[PDB]
């Protein structure tokens, strides 16, 4: 349970750095922008996850449908197994039925 004996270097975060100052800027792009682009377009991320959401099973299932043929063998195999597991678990296990 030994706790560190030396004060860490105090980390100074300036909140006025560029990324923090400009945060959330174009979020209203739809409303103020005479709707053309939905805020989804702003989302930088994995291809299957842009502007979408879901529980781990749905997530995996979707990843496989979209990028499943660009995947590495090991990773595709792992994904299939994860899907099968999650399927069995969600459908057949739990308290609530």
């Amino acid at each position: 349970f030994h706790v560190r004996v030396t004060l860490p270097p105090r980390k100074v975060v300036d909140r006025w750095n560029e990324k923090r100052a400009m945060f959330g800027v174009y979020d209203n792009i739809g409303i103020l922008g005479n709707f053309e682009k939905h805020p989804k377009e702003l989302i930088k991320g994995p291809i299957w996850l842009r502007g979408w959401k879901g529980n781990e099973l749905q997530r995996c299932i979707r990843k496989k449908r979209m990028v499943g043929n660009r995947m590495f063998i090991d990773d595709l195999h792992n994904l299939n197994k994860r899907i099968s597991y999650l399927y069995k678990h969600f459908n057949r296990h739990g308290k609530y039925r």
Partner: protein
Amino acid sequence: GPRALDLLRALPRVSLANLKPNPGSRKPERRPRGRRRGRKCGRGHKGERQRGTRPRLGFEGGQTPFYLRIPKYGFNEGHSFRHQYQPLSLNRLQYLIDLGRVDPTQPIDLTQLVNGRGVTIQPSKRDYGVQLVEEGADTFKAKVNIEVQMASELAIAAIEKNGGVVTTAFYDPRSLEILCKPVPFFLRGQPIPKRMLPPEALVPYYTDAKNRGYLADPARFPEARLELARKYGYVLPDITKDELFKMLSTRKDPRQIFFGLAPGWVVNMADKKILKPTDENLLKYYSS
């Protein structure tokens, strides 16, 4: 106005630092830690359930399940193929006219009802269109040219008395979809398709002047129409002598989706132009 605003001069800035979700908005979740929510953690003791394995939903523990001892009977039998007509009461029609959503001046068909959001069609659910029902019959004072896919004697009667005209028209599913949301169709880049005819079961409906069917022989119209007066005891107006008459007489071709456009044309909405085929074969196909 909002006296709340005057309390805001006195208080500190609203910043990201002080922000409270409305009390009750978030019911805090609880985790199986500690003396209360730990130690069997709401799962009970041993058996099938503490282990998470209890059987599927309908299962009664081996006795023949309730939902399977009851005998099969056609209830939902062929449900997908039944026709569905979204009801529109005269009360709603009147209320829409009164508030200037649909205007009685020009002819009223499905697209007009949809654009006023007086009604909502979803063809995918096998909606075949609007039907007219009599709920507001007594109260109905408006003078309209209306086209629906079904109507009741009483509804028709209530529209005639006020000097309007009702007509029942048929649209097939594709036609219907195009009709209700026209602008999404015009971005589709396809010609305007032929209106299909009604199927064999619905022919005796649209061929009768009783229903004021769009396929009905107009020779019977003024006869049957007058009949409806004798029954409900009102003087039938002469629609001919009215000033709005040229609008009231307006029909569609039985093969036409819209008013004033024609099967086989193409609407280019960026140039605000229409395009029509000069070809003979195309003109024979679309005009048949």
